Amino acid sequence: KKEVRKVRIALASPEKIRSWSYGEVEKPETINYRTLKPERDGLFDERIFGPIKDYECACGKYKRQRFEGKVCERCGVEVTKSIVRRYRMGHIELATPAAHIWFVKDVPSKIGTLLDLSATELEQVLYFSKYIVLDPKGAILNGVPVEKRQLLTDEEYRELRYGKQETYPLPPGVDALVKDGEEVVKGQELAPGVVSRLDGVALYRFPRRVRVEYVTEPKDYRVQPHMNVVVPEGARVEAGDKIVAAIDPEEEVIAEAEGVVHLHEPASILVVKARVYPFEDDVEVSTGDRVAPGDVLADGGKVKSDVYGRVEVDLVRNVVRVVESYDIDARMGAEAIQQLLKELDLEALEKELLEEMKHPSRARRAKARKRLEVVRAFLDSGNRPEWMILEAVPVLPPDLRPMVQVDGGRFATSDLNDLYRRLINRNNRLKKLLAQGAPEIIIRNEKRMLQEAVDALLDNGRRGAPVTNPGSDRPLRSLTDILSGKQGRFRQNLLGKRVDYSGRSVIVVGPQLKLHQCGLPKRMALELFKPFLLKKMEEKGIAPNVKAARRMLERQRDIKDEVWDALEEVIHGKVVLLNRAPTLHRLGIQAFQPVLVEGQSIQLHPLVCEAFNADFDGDQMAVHVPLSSFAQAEARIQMLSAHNLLSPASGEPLAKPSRDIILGLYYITQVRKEKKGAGLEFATPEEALAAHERGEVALNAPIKVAGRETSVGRLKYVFANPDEALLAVAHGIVDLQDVVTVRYMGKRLETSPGRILFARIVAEAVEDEKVAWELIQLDVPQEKNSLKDLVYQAFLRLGMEKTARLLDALKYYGFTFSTTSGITIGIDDAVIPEEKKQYLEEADRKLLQIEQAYEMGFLTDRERYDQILQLWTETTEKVTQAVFKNFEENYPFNPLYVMAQSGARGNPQQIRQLCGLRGLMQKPSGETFEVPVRSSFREGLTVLEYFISSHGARKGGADTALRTADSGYLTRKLVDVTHEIVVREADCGTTNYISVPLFQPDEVTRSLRLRKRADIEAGLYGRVLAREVEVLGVRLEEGRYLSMDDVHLLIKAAEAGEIQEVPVRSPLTCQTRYGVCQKCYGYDLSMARPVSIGEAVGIVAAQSIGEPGTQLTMRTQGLPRVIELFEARRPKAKAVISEIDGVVRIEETEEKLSVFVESEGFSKEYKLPKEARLLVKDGDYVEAGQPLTRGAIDPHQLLEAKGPEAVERYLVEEIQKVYRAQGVKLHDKHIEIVVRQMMKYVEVTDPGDSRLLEGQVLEKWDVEALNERLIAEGKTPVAWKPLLMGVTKSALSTKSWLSAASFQNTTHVLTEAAIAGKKDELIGLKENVILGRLIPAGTGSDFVRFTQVVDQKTLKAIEEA
Amino acid sequence: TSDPVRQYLHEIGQVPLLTLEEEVELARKVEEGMEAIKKLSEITGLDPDLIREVVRAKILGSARVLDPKTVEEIDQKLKSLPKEHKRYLHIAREGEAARQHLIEANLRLVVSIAKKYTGRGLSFLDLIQEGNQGLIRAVEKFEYKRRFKFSTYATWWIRQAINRAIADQARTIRIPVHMVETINKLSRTARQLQQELGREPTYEEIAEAMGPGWDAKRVEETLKIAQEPVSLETPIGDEKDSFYGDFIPDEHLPSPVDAA
DNA sequence: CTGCATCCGAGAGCTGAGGGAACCCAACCAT
DNA sequence: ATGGTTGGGTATAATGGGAGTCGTCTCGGATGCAG
C-alpha cells in the first residue's frame, strides 16, 4: 500500500461519470410500500448499489461466502460486502444538457469570461429568455445583417423564422375593399374601417356569402361558421359538382348548373408578406419545407423561387406560396452554451488576448488579463470547457442519503432523495414529451424546469425562491449545503470529531493533590479503562475469560473489591488529558496522573486554575485517555502539567501562587508598626528596656538609642538561630510579625520570624541554602510580583522539577498560614475616611460658584458641563487618595487593604467604590450625567443612583457578550492564516535583520524618550543578536540568545547613552520556505531556551494573539482596532501622509486650508478639510511617509510611500499598542509571524522574459526563484512590487485548496481549484488533519521521526556481523 | 428574470385564442390529416407509426434534431408515388401544423383548470405540464363530428391527467392509485364524520360508515401505510445546531466488542 | 481613456452541556 | 389459484396565479458621472 502524498481535483467528463456509475436510475421509486425492499430501477436498487446484507443476493439463491464477483441470474445482485452501498454511485442521463450552477453563479461567471457574455445575458440564455445565433445564414434584422453570438428576443426570431401574418376580424356581413390573393401595399385599406400596415397579399378567412352564377344570373348562398367553402375563388363549376361540402347530407350545397364563383363578406383577413406561384401539376416541395432561390418547386422546374423562405402549397386554390423567412440556427439553454463551448479554440483565443495585452488602456488590460487567467488555467489543466456543462448527473450512494426506520417504526429520509425524485420526474416527463412531438412552448417550459431542478439539486436557494417541502418553510439541503457552513462536513466532521474513551464532569478543588496529579472518580476510571481492566483481570483469577469479565462488570451490584485494585494497577504511571471549553490556548488541555477518589467530581489542583481559566461555580471539564505508547509518551513528556510552567505568549510564569496563597504569605511576611513610642529618644538601651517594661513604649516602636534607630524588639529578643526564634513564637513570647534580631547564615539579621520562616520554607523546598538565599528578597513583604519573580528565578537557576517542588511547598504553607491568619470581612472593615465629608462640601461649594458663572454669561452650557465633569473627577481621585492614605496610616492590616496591596484580589477602583463613592456614570448615549453618585456601597444606594448605574452595568454585559464572539472569530482567522508556519531548519543563512529601537519620539516631538521596560523586554527577550554589540565593557557576540539579564544590561547601557537600537534576527527576515528557522525565531518562551526544531510556532502565535482579545481587550480603539489592523482595512478616520520628501508650507485662506510639500525636485500639494488638525509647523522638514494630520494611517499608502519595512514596524507597534494599553504582556514574535504571512504576495509590473502576466498576484518566493533561474539563463528578470492584503484574503489565496475550501467561500475555492486542476501537496497542518495523517510538526517532523534507538550489546553484535 | 410562472404565463398570453370558425377548421384539418396518414400508410404498405414519425420530423424541421438519412430517404420514397394520391401528404402536413396551432391556442385550458389544484404535494408547474400532456391526448383523440366544443372533451382528459399525476408523484413512497383513492375516501369520510358529530371520530365509526368489508383493524393499517418519512434535519431545540438524524444509531454494522 | 463614486449583491458573525381535495372499468402479472 | 396491480375512459361549457418583509456590516465587482 503506497502512501498518499498529493490530492488532485479536476473537472469530470461525461465519460468519467458514466464509468463511475454502476447503472442508470430510470424511475423515481424509492422503496416498496409493502415489503420495505428497494424497488427495481429505483433510487435504492441493489443491482446498482450493492446488496443490503453481506454475501446474500436479493432472491436468496446465494447466502454464503466464496461467491465474490458472482452476479445472481434471477435478481442481478452481486454477492459481496454490504459496505459497498456507501461507495457505489449511480447516474441519471439527461434528455437535454444542463448547466452546472457553480460555474454560472460564482461572480464573475466562468462561462461569461470564456464566452465574453455578461451575467444578465448568460442568465437570459440559460433560463430560456433570449436566443443566441449560430450560423446566421445571411439574415437581415432591421436592415442590419445578423452575426454570430447575437441575442434576439422571441419577437425578432418569430419574425425572421416565420414572417409577419397579421389577422383582421372583419365584422359579420361587411364586404372587403380588397379581393383575396392580391398584393396590398402598406396603408391600402382592406375594409371601410380596416387598414393594413404591412406589404403582402390579403387572404380571405371564412367568407360569409358566396355568389354563384348559372348559365346568366347570380345567386347567393350563406356560409355559416360550421361549414367550409371548397371551390377556389374565380373557378368555374359544373352541374352536379359540390361547392359547400357539408357534414350533413341534407346540408350539402351542390351546384345546379355551370357558373363562376365569388366569395364576399370575409370573416377575417390574413395579410402576409410572401411570393405566389401557380402550378398545373404535381408539386415537389410540401408544406413546412424551406427553399432557396433557384430551386425546383413544380412543373419540372418551370417555376423557380427568388427569395429565401418557407413553402406552403395551398391546395384550395392550387397555388404555392413562399413566405419570406430564413434558416437561421438559434438554440437555447445549456445545449447552446455547450455547442458554443466546443467550437472554442483555446490557442487562437490566447493569441488574441496576448495581442490585447498591448493596449494603452489599463481597464482593457485588466479585463484581458482576467480572461487570460481562466483561459490559461484551462489550457494548463487539460480540462475541456464543455465539461462545465452536465450531460449525465451522478447519484450519491444511498448509504450517505439514508432512508432508515426509526426505533418507533416511522421512516426518516434525506432531502437529497426528494431532490433526486424531482429531477427524475422532470427528466422522465421531458423524455415523454420529446417522444410525442409536442409544440415548442411546452418543450421550452420543460427544459426550463429541468434546468431549475438541476440548479436546486446542485445549489438550492441561490437563484430565485428556494425549493421547500410542502407544509414547511424549511429549504431542502443540497450537496453544497452539506459541504459548506458551520454545520457542513468540513467544519463539523473533518476538523473536529466526537471521540471514544472520554468523559465529562464538574470540577472540585483538589488542595491535597500534587502538581502533576488530578482526582478522578472511581466510576469514571472504571468506565474509561475498561479494556485494560478486563485484560488485567484476565491476568489475575478474577474472571476465566474476557466475556465473563464483561458480564461481571456489566451490572453495578456485580462488582467486587479486587476489581478496584486491578484498576489501580492498570492506571499506574499513565496520564489522562483534561480539557475545559473554550480552549483559548494550548494550556487548555493538560496531562495529569489520575488518583482514584470517591464521589462524582473531578479534583483539580489549585495552581492550574489560572491556566485553565477555571473556577468552581459549576464549571465542567472533559477527560480523555491516550491509548498507545506514543500518545502516552507525548502526554507525559510534552503535556505534563509540571513541565509547563511559563507562558508561551510572554515567557512569564503561568502556574504561580494566587488568591489565598499570597494572602497567607503576605500576612506572615508583613511586619508590625506601632505609634506608642513614636520616635522617642533614649541614651542607653537599658533605659529603653526599662521604659518598655514600665509600659511607656511599644515593643516595635521605632525608637532612637545612642543616635541609631532600633526597637525594643531588636534588643530584648536576640536569638542564636531560627529554631529558638520559632520556639519562642510557639510559646507566645513573640508573634510572627514582631521584628527581632536572628543569627542566620553566619550573619545577624534584623528581621521578623515570619520572614525567616519563609526563607527556611524556600531553602528546604529547593534543597539548597545558598541558592535559595540568593533568590529571595528578604526585606519586602511577599506579594504577587515578588513571588512571580522568585518562581522565574528558581526555574532559571534550578530546573522545572525543583520549581514544581518549590511551588507545591509554597502552596501548602500559604494555605496553612491563611487558615489561621484570621482574615474576615465585616461591614465596619470598609472604613470611610472623615476627609470625604469635607471633600464633598468643597464640591458643593464650587458647584454654586459654577452656577453663578453660568447665570452671569461668563460660561456657556458646554463649558459648565465640562467644568462639572472635571471637578467631580478630581474629587473622585482625591477621595481615592484619602481612602488609601487612611488605610495605610490607621488600619495597616485591614482585610480589603491587605487584599488590594498583596495582589490577591481587588483593584483600587473597586475599593474606592466600596468606601468613598462610585462617581460619575454614563448615559446609554455615551455622555456623562451631571449629578454623580455620592453614596458608597457601605452606606447604601438610593433608587435613582442604582437605576443610573444599571446603564453602565448593562452596557458592560452586552459589550462582553459581543466581544467574546468577535474574539473567537479573530482567533479562528489567525489560526487559519498562520497554521503552516513551522520551525524547519537550524539556520537559513540570511544576513538581514531588524533594528529594535530603545527610544521613541515624544508626543510633542521634543526629543526621544526611553521606552518602558516592559516593551523593551517584550521586544528583546529571547532574540538572537544579529550583530556584535559593545556596551559597558561587555562584548555581546553575534549569535547570542538574549536572556533577561542581557536585556537589563542593554537597557542600563541605553540609559547611559551608549546605544540607541539593537540589531536582532526576526521571522520578518527569515528565508526558510513554509516556516521559520531556529535562529530567526529564538527562545521557546515556555522553557527559556532555544526553540526546538519542529515546533508549530504558527498555531502558538495565533493562539497567543487571540487569547487576550477575549475579555482582556475591551470595546479605532480596543478590539475593533485590532480587527481593522489585522485585516488592513482603510481607516474611516484616515490621515494624510506625504508620498515624497520635501519642506512644509501651510497655506491657509479664510475659506480653505492646504499644505504644500516642496522638495528640491518637485512640489506636491495636499488639500485637506479645514476642521482637521496638523502635526506640522510652517517651515519644517518632513520625511516620506510622515503624517500631516492626526488619525490612523492607511497601510497601503504607507506601503506605497516608504516600503515594506515601515509598514512592518507600523503594524507591529500599532497592534502592540492596544495590548499594552490593557496591561497584557505579549511577545513581538507572534505578531511578526502574522505580519509576515500578511505580506506574502507580490504583483508583477513588468513580466520581462517570463510567461507571467502584468498585474498577476503571486507568492514572493515563487517570483524570486523565477528571477533567479531567469538571470542564470541570461534573460530579462521580472519586475514586481510588494502587496499587502488582510488575513482573510491572504488565507484564501493559499496554494492548498483543502484548507481554503475548509475555511470560507467554499464554492469559489472549489470551482477555481477544479478549473485549474490544482494539486494539494499536503504541506500545512490542516490538510494532514483532514486526511487523518501525521502532521509535519512535533514528533511527525522529518527531522526527528526517523530516529532509531538501540542498546550497546545489539550494536556490538551488528558490528561483528 | 426570476419567477418562472410569470414568464410562462406571458408566453402563453402571447398566443391568441381561436374563434368557433377557427376551432372547427382546425379540428376538421386534424381529422382529414389522420385519415390521409392512414391512406398513405395503406398506399405504401408500411407501418403507420413510422410514416407518422417521418411527417413529424418534416413539420418540426432540421431544427429538431430517427436520423436525417432515414427520414429523407422515405420522404423521397413517397414522392415517387403518382399524383392524385399525393394530396394526402400535403393534408397530413397541414393537419400536423393544425395540431400545433390548436395545442398552442388551447394551452390556457390547462392553467385555468390547474390553478385550483395547488397544495396537494405537487407544484403548480408540474400540474400544468401534466395538463398539457392530457391536452395532447385529448387533441389526438378528439372527434369533431359530434359538433361538441373542444373544452368539453378536453376538460375530462385534463382532470384525469392531473389526478393521475397527483396519485403518482405526490408522495415519496409510491402507493398505487387505487390505494391512494382509498386513503382519499378514508380522509373525506373521517372529516365528514368529525364535522357532523363534533369531535375526532374513532376507527370503528369510520369503518361502520364505509360499509361492508371494512373493520377498525384495516382502517388502522390504512392510516399506518399512509405515513410519509420525516426529514433528518428537523431543528431540535432553540439553537440551530441540533438535528433529528444526529440521534440515530447504526444497528447493522458489528460493534468493536462483537468483532473482537 | 483616467478617475471618481456611488450602487447592489454575497457572505459572515465563540465553545460546550442539554434541547424533541373522483369514480368507474377491465385487463394483467407475482406468487 | 389468488389479489393486488396497471393502464384507459368518462361529450352543455368550462381558456394569464398568487404571496408578500422589512432593528447588520463589510467586500468586490458593475454603471454612470465629471474630466
Ligand SMILES: [Mg+2]
Ligand atoms: Mg464558570
Ligand SMILES: [Mg+2]
Ligand atoms: Mg533577651
Ligand SMILES: [Zn+2]
Ligand atoms: Zn439472487
Ligand SMILES: [Zn+2]
Ligand atoms: Zn531564518
